[PDB]
Symmetry: C4
Subunit: 82 residues, 4 copies
Amino acid sequence: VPATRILLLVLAVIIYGTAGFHFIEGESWTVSLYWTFVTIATVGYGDYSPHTPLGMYFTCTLIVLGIGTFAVAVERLLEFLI
Amino acid sequence: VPATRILLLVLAVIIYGTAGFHFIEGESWTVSLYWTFVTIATVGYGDYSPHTPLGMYFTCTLIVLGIGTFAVAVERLLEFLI
Amino acid sequence: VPATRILLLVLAVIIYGTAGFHFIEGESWTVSLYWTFVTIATVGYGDYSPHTPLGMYFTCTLIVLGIGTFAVAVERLLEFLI
Amino acid sequence: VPATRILLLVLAVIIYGTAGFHFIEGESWTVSLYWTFVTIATVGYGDYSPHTPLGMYFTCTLIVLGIGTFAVAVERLLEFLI
Ligand SMILES: [K+]
Ligand SMILES: [K+]
Ligand SMILES: [K+]
Ligand SMILES: [K+]
């Protein structure tokens, strides 16, 4: 799949994750964006995490939709810098 | 391996993880499902984790049986939406 | 690489990780084994982690020697159950 | 890509991550090196993490530039030990 398409896909995941965390868990846009990257990259510091059932469900959806997309995006980015 | 078979395998892992954590560590079904995803996806927030020796042994079994299965499931899911 | 050789390699990693965390960080053998799996699988709950400079150095060595070995072991294990 | 080149690339990531965390978040050089490995390997214990907006932005940059580089480095290292 074209690298630029994979870029748009991961940007869409990032918007989804960030807006979701912001509105569901109430954290700031900046913290939510950070939490989104930390989650889809599978880092998972745990400094931020969902504390509501809706947030937990949402996080599972983000995990399923976002980890693979992020992994593909990283590997494509590798091809370009490297 | 057929995508639908991989689906059944990851659903089986999810049931195993969720019921195990619920019964061993005593967390609610919802928290246990969430913890299962967070674990097999290798996110590992650490907001929930086992606090008993049996829970620790169980978590190691889940890690070994579940991380690979979830990884294959994600990559198969990639192909379908993408 | 033969699957059984990969098994021995990951067992060697597990022994190294467990003994090291036990002796350097002072946690029980059981906690240390659990921490080793949680680390080399890249889950990283953070319920346990090194609190000394030697422990931090050691953990970096385990990360480098163990994450790859564990990942290959998992994928070979997938071939056998699946 | 030649293994030695991948080695230089991951060393550059490690320097970037370590110096960045040290200067932005104020942790010691040793803690910062440890945090860098824990982050780019995707372990993410969360015993250390950024607490400023600049640190969060920086961490996202390190995650994008470093996780892929580390993954390739680990797999090349595997080829040599194994
Ligand atoms: K983690
Ligand atoms: K991970
Ligand atoms: K993790
Ligand atoms: K954590």
